[PDB]
Amino acid sequence: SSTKNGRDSESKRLGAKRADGQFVTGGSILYRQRGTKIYPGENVGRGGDDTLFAKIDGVVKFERKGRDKKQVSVYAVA
Amino acid sequence: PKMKTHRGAAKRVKRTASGQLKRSRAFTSHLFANKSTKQKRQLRKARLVSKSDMKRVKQLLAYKK
Amino acid sequence: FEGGQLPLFRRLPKRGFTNINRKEYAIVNLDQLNKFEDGTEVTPALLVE
RNA sequence: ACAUAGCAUAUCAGAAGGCACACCCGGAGAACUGAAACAUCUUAGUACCCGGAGGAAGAGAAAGAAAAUCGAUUCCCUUA
RNA sequence: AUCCUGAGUACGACGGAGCACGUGAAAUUCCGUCGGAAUCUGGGAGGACCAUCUCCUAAGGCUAAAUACUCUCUAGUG
RNA sequence: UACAAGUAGUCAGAGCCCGUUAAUGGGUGAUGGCGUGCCUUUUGUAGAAUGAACCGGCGAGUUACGAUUUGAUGCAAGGUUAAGCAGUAAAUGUGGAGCCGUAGCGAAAGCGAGUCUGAAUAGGGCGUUUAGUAUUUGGUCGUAGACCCGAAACCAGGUGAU
RNA sequence: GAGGGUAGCGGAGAAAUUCCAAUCGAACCUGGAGAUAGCUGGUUCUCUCCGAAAUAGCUUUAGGGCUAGCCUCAAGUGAUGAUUAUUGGAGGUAGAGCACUGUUUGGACGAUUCAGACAAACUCCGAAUGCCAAUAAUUUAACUUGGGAGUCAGAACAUGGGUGAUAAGGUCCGUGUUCGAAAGGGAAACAGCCCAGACCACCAGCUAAGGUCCCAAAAU
RNA sequence: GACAAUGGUAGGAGAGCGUUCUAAGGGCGUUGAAGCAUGAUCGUAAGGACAUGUGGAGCGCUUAGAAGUGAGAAUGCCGGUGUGAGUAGCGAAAGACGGGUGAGAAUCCCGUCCACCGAUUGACUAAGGUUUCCAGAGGAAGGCUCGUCCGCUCUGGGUUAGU
RNA sequence: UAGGCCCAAGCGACUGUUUAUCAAAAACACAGGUCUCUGCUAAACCGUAAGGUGAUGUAUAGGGGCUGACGCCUGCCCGGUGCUGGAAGGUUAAGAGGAGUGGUUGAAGCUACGAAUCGAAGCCCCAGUAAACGGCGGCCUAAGGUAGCGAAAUUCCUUGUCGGGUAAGUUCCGACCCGCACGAAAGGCGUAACGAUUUGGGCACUGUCUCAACGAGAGACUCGGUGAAAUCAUAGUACCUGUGAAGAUGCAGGUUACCCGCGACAGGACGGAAAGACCCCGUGGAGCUUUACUGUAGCCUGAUAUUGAAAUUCGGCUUUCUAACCCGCACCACUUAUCGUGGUGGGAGACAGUGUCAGGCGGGCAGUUUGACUGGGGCGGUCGCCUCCUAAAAGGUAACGGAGGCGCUCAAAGGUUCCCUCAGAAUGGUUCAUUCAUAGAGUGUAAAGGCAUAAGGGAGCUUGACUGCGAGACCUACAAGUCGAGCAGGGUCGAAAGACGGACUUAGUGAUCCGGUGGUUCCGCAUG
RNA sequence: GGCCGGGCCACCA
Ligand SMILES: [K+]
Ligand SMILES: [K+]
Ligand SMILES: [K+]
Ligand SMILES: [K+]
Ligand SMILES: [K+]
Ligand SMILES: [Mg+2]
Ligand SMILES: [Mg+2]
Ligand SMILES: [Mg+2]
Ligand SMILES: [Mg+2]
Ligand SMILES: [Mg+2]
Ligand SMILES: [Mg+2]
Ligand SMILES: [Mg+2]
Ligand SMILES: [Mg+2]
Ligand SMILES: [Mg+2]
Ligand SMILES: [Mg+2]
Ligand SMILES: [Mg+2]
Ligand SMILES: [Mg+2]
Ligand SMILES: [Mg+2]
Ligand SMILES: [Mg+2]
Ligand SMILES: [Mg+2]
Ligand SMILES: [Mg+2]
Ligand SMILES: [Mg+2]
Ligand SMILES: [Mg+2]
Ligand SMILES: [Mg+2]
Ligand SMILES: [Mg+2]
Ligand SMILES: [Mg+2]
Ligand SMILES: [Mg+2]
Ligand SMILES: [Mg+2]
Ligand SMILES: [Mg+2]
Ligand SMILES: [Mg+2]
Ligand SMILES: [Mg+2]
Ligand SMILES: [Mg+2]
Ligand SMILES: [Mg+2]
Ligand SMILES: [Mg+2]
Ligand SMILES: [Mg+2]
Ligand SMILES: [Mg+2]
Ligand SMILES: [Mg+2]
Ligand SMILES: [Mg+2]
Ligand SMILES: [Mg+2]
Ligand SMILES: [Mg+2]
Ligand SMILES: [Mg+2]
Ligand SMILES: [Mg+2]
Ligand SMILES: [Mg+2]
Ligand SMILES: [Mg+2]
Ligand SMILES: [Mg+2]
Ligand SMILES: [Mg+2]
Ligand SMILES: [Mg+2]
Ligand SMILES: [Mg+2]
Ligand SMILES: [Mg+2]
Ligand SMILES: [Mg+2]
Ligand SMILES: [Mg+2]
Ligand SMILES: [Mg+2]
Ligand SMILES: [Mg+2]
Ligand SMILES: [Mg+2]
Ligand SMILES: [Mg+2]
Ligand SMILES: [Mg+2]
Ligand SMILES: [Mg+2]
Ligand SMILES: [Mg+2]
Ligand SMILES: [Mg+2]
Ligand SMILES: [Mg+2]
Ligand SMILES: [Mg+2]
Ligand SMILES: [Mg+2]
Ligand SMILES: [Mg+2]
Ligand SMILES: [Mg+2]
Ligand SMILES: [Mg+2]
Ligand SMILES: [Mg+2]
Ligand SMILES: [Mg+2]
Ligand SMILES: [Mg+2]
Ligand SMILES: [Mg+2]
Ligand SMILES: [Mg+2]
Ligand SMILES: [Mg+2]
Ligand SMILES: [Mg+2]
Ligand SMILES: [Mg+2]
Ligand SMILES: [Mg+2]
Ligand SMILES: [Mg+2]
Ligand SMILES: [Mg+2]
Ligand SMILES: [Mg+2]
Ligand SMILES: [Mg+2]
Ligand SMILES: [Mg+2]
Ligand SMILES: [Mg+2]
Ligand SMILES: [Mg+2]
Ligand SMILES: [Mg+2]
Ligand SMILES: [Mg+2]
Ligand SMILES: [Mg+2]
Ligand SMILES: [Mg+2]
Ligand SMILES: [Mg+2]
Ligand SMILES: [Mg+2]
Ligand SMILES: [Mg+2]
Ligand SMILES: [Mg+2]
Ligand SMILES: [Mg+2]
Ligand SMILES: [Mg+2]
Ligand SMILES: [Mg+2]
Ligand SMILES: [Mg+2]
Ligand SMILES: [Mg+2]
Ligand SMILES: [Mg+2]
Ligand SMILES: [Mg+2]
Ligand SMILES: [Mg+2]
Ligand SMILES: [Mg+2]
Ligand SMILES: [Mg+2]
Ligand SMILES: [Mg+2]
Ligand SMILES: [Mg+2]
Ligand SMILES: [Mg+2]
Ligand SMILES: [Mg+2]
Ligand SMILES: [Mg+2]
Ligand SMILES: [Mg+2]
Ligand SMILES: [Mg+2]
Ligand SMILES: [Mg+2]
Ligand SMILES: [Mg+2]
Ligand SMILES: [Mg+2]
Ligand SMILES: [Mg+2]
Ligand SMILES: [Mg+2]
Ligand SMILES: [Mg+2]
Ligand SMILES: [Mg+2]
Ligand SMILES: [Mg+2]
Ligand SMILES: [Mg+2]
Ligand SMILES: [Mg+2]
Ligand SMILES: [Mg+2]
Ligand SMILES: [Mg+2]
Ligand SMILES: [Mg+2]
Ligand SMILES: [Mg+2]
Ligand SMILES: [Mg+2]
Ligand SMILES: [Mg+2]
Ligand SMILES: [Mg+2]
Structure with a gap:
């Protein structure tokens, strides 16, 4: 038949x-996602489609938050 | 005989000082309810003909200075 | 020709018109007037000559 | 019926047909082809056909070009 | 400017064609069919059309040269 | 050279016969090792896929006009003429109309080292903060049949019912 | 039998697509005309340096094309390339597990509980690797702008998987190698396996895979 | 001098060989040019010389310029020549002998006998062909063998209408 | 030298005709039947026309369709399509008719447009017609198969079943009916005669055969003469097992083999011949069809010109007239003439015919289109977008692999401030209460990723579901797509910090060209 | 879409 x-x-x-420890300019996307698989931290914004972006020039740091969140x-x- | 300008192309681009071609944007004729506000606002802004396309179409506009 | 993909100069819109009475001027900048002696009377005939 | 059509005779020797008919003017006029198909469009008013001529032909003495004025037509450059 | 100055003409509708231009904002030129003016206070054009302005004076004809070609002829050339 | 199994050569090699552009020479070759032509087309061909009987001749990216790029050369904020005229079918002289450049931005009116958008003294796009131009060799593209040969067909005008 | 008539957008046919000058679903000749041919075939001297691809996207596209990817040539620019060490990070595979979803076996108590299993679309967990970066060692690229391409039929082997039947010299993706475009030694012969990349010459030497009784080099 | 690199299809880049013609310069050649043939020659290749024979009048070299500039394949075009091979065939059939002619005879002429057709393999008209008809001479080619013969070759002839 | 004959079945009545050159037949024709058209300048046909055929014929004639001697017959359905006739009700073009409006010059005027309404055929509607096209059930229809025939030139199952014929019969003959899928002029069922027709049986007879033998001649073979051809990379050209582009003369290992002819045979040289006719592919061709698209020859219909005069009746309609036009009507002349022209009668007549314009019909004829993927093609399925798995712990990653969803919705289901917390279980009650309950609920919708900062639930106010943008970044061949701090203008909510450029996130879409609408310090062909 | 009561006519991103 047919499928x-x-x-x-x-x-x-x-x-x-972007990598942890890498320097980025303001507006650089750090993470594309559905939902908050990773949360926005210090000087980081969360866009309408949950994109995380740097709000300043600086160095990216991925860190833990609470027990089961990043x-x-x-x-x-x- | 002389090479002939592509008149359709000539109606859609203009040459810049550096020799690039300024172009208008597609998706700007109708169906504006289906595109968001920012989409239309940013589609009002002209672009350039890409280098890959220039490689293909440069001879069609050799006379348009 | 793009093999049947709609070509670039068909997927892009036409823009604008051409003015029949378009006036285009010959332009002389200040730096080009420096070749004349002090007190000269500059005229299109003199600039052409 | 007048007339005309027609008929006979003399006089003229006007036409006919040909071509390098290459170029030229006119009548008539495709298709393969291109458009990556195809009908509008293109090939192209091209090929072929027909008519008429000349040493050239055609055009020509502004109910024009223009927008500061030029002064019939034609042809070359350029505009492009 | 008293008289004359090209009439089934110009022009218009419909159908076509020629104009670089596919009827289009399409003027300008021509053909068929049908209609159909004005008369120097006139008429036509300046790319729809109107007004002013500007230029011209249709609907009769003639005209060399610059230009096209080579079956040929004469003399030559690569 | 008549006990021998093979793309016919190649490398090794005695024997025999010669003697040169005189060279660590020429002809032939017992016997041993190694070894499935060429071209095309293919993932892959010894291919039992294509093509060629052999030999000879002939037989396929050219030229014109435009475009772009590179090299060369002249001149340089300039560079250069076209037709035409003169000249020997020449070089060349003359011819500055025209073309490109010296300024861009804008759909345009326009403004101008800026300009467009914008209400903006904002931001952003394209620009400014020199180098072009003429000829020409080479490469490539475009219009021409455009590297060469090859259809089945289509159209037009003729010729045929011996 | 003779003399005539009908002609190709046509004739003629007691009809067969039948005949029209030895092949008629539309005769023959010449011209348009070098029709067009994204198809097949062919394309001629030499050496030197470099050297692909058989992929993605779109395509009345699928044996064609276009841009990108990979090759080359020339100018630029100059740490931006590569490998390793260390450090940091993202993520849920292998394994494992049953905390959720689903599947399942035997008890117990009157759905819960005890014990034991299963999973690409289950996860309380979770590697090795690979990836992204940051500043030392080794190394030699890298990028940008232009001129010129070719390629878009791939193949085997190993390995992670789908599909098939834990079939195929099957087919479709990931990863690596080789062939393609690579001769030389080994695997009897044998593109794709193993060793190894031929500038030329030598009747020198050391080795690789693989071998050492004879064929046939080296240990009866 | 001392280090490195140098397998290669599509394809990119570079440098060269040779062909014909032109310009300029400088040369060769009847004491022998080009072409052809042979050779044991030179160069990294394309290729370049020399010597000898043949040939009998044109041709190199240098630098630069221009191209109808290089063939092994296209079931390529034209020409020549092989192979198959002394092979297939030699196109419906009854001939034998004597004599003659001749350089030559199964094959020509003559004779006898034999045999075949005979509603025709006989005779005469038409179409069509157009000299093939006759005589004398010939034997290169044509004749599917031969040939002294011939519808073949050479030379000369031949067709007569009032019905 | 000179018919073989008999019994039986299918097909076609018969003599005849046909694919020159693989088919002679059951195919064509035929006499006969029927339908239909045609009143004569017939219809039909050739031709642009003139002129012709039809026919020097005239409905007992001529053209076209179907059937196919003859015999007995030929049923049911008119809903659909075609054809024929009615109704002038709706709809429609040219043309007429001009109410009105825009541009320009307060206007004329010039100019661009423009509705009442009049206006044919066709189409829609109604009726009829089946020897018209067709159809002849599974409650449905227009109607549901009559006679005759039937395992058939028709029957798949199938060598149906039974009988006959044979020792044995998938063929044949006779029956049955369960007719996959007979059936009445694309005729049904029979039928003497006829047939180089197809089929079964029998007698005669035989080298067809058991089973081959001999003989004659022509070739073949030997000799003399003469002397081709297809083919051909070079060839000193073995076999076996294997290898290999998976079937080897040519490669490996063995085995076998002195050199050269001649007569024979065909296993191999994937032998020769013809660039596979099958199959697929090419945005190749040609012929043919049609309710494919677009045209068109022709025909029908209307207006108008040619084209005139009177009336009646409602711009028309109708009638009459003669003088245009017409007559393949008669006579007369040119003229010994079935052409033509002229004359005179007669007929017809502003019709017809013809030009221009318009509407309709129009495979009669023409130009073309009629996709791709695909474990060959066709048939089936699919084609864009979103989510998951395959996917090998970044990203990416295929199959006609495994699963689903989208082509929206919401004026709140958007914004903001404040507040709030679920499903379920147990236990009590003729929805409520208590207790646990990290979410096992909910989140507009598919899935995944998120969410108790709630992103889930409620309320107040509100419209940021803003205008101009935009550093930088993701994704990416291009075109596109995505995220975005922040600046400015004006706001909403909040005491305020502040949040807000739609929605928990990711589908809900379509380029260009063309056209419509709104606005506009732009252009607008001498000037306005 | 036009017009009339579903039918005719019209439609060249
Ligand atoms: K073959
Ligand atoms: K009916
Ligand atoms: K009916
Ligand atoms: K039966
Ligand atoms: K049947
Ligand atoms: Mg959103
Ligand atoms: Mg718009
Ligand atoms: Mg005369
Ligand atoms: Mg005369
Ligand atoms: Mg003449
Ligand atoms: Mg003439
Ligand atoms: Mg085309
Ligand atoms: Mg003529
Ligand atoms: Mg003439
Ligand atoms: Mg006048
Ligand atoms: Mg026109
Ligand atoms: Mg015009
Ligand atoms: Mg016009
Ligand atoms: Mg006018
Ligand atoms: Mg032996
Ligand atoms: Mg021996
Ligand atoms: Mg042998
Ligand atoms: Mg060997
Ligand atoms: Mg290849
Ligand atoms: Mg193959
Ligand atoms: Mg070979
Ligand atoms: Mg062979
Ligand atoms: Mg082939
Ligand atoms: Mg061959
Ligand atoms: Mg040859
Ligand atoms: Mg070329
Ligand atoms: Mg190119
Ligand atoms: Mg003819
Ligand atoms: Mg016949
Ligand atoms: Mg035939
Ligand atoms: Mg047939
Ligand atoms: Mg024939
Ligand atoms: Mg042509
Ligand atoms: Mg050709
Ligand atoms: Mg290399
Ligand atoms: Mg591929
Ligand atoms: Mg498409
Ligand atoms: Mg596991
Ligand atoms: Mg269990
Ligand atoms: Mg279990
Ligand atoms: Mg798992
Ligand atoms: Mg396998
Ligand atoms: Mg495979
Ligand atoms: Mg792989
Ligand atoms: Mg390699
Ligand atoms: Mg190898
Ligand atoms: Mg090897
Ligand atoms: Mg080996
Ligand atoms: Mg073995
Ligand atoms: Mg070996
Ligand atoms: Mg092996
Ligand atoms: Mg050693
Ligand atoms: Mg050994
Ligand atoms: Mg040994
Ligand atoms: Mg090399
Ligand atoms: Mg090497
Ligand atoms: Mg090159
Ligand atoms: Mg060179
Ligand atoms: Mg040279
Ligand atoms: Mg010479
Ligand atoms: Mg040549
Ligand atoms: Mg050849
Ligand atoms: Mg030969
Ligand atoms: Mg031979
Ligand atoms: Mg012999
Ligand atoms: Mg033989
Ligand atoms: Mg023989
Ligand atoms: Mg013989
Ligand atoms: Mg004979
Ligand atoms: Mg006899
Ligand atoms: Mg004689
Ligand atoms: Mg002879
Ligand atoms: Mg003679
Ligand atoms: Mg019969
Ligand atoms: Mg008969
Ligand atoms: Mg036959
Ligand atoms: Mg056959
Ligand atoms: Mg026969
Ligand atoms: Mg008649
Ligand atoms: Mg019949
Ligand atoms: Mg019958
Ligand atoms: Mg009936
Ligand atoms: Mg009815
Ligand atoms: Mg009407
Ligand atoms: Mg009407
Ligand atoms: Mg069946
Ligand atoms: Mg029997
Ligand atoms: Mg029976
Ligand atoms: Mg029937
Ligand atoms: Mg019937
Ligand atoms: Mg018998
Ligand atoms: Mg014999
Ligand atoms: Mg012999
Ligand atoms: Mg091999
Ligand atoms: Mg094998
Ligand atoms: Mg074998
Ligand atoms: Mg061997
Ligand atoms: Mg033999
Ligand atoms: Mg054989
Ligand atoms: Mg064969
Ligand atoms: Mg073929
Ligand atoms: Mg074929
Ligand atoms: Mg076959
Ligand atoms: Mg009419
Ligand atoms: Mg057709
Ligand atoms: Mg065509
Ligand atoms: Mg397909
Ligand atoms: Mg298939
Ligand atoms: Mg389907
Ligand atoms: Mg995905
Ligand atoms: Mg991974
Ligand atoms: Mg991943
Ligand atoms: Mg779905
Ligand atoms: Mg859907
Ligand atoms: Mg809430
Ligand atoms: Mg909300
Ligand atoms: Mg004007
Ligand atoms: Mg104006």
């Missing part, structure tokens, strides 16, 4: 876009 399957959507290239911050380079 009823065969469909899929375009992959959305989610995940980390966050990413950006800190001004001294």
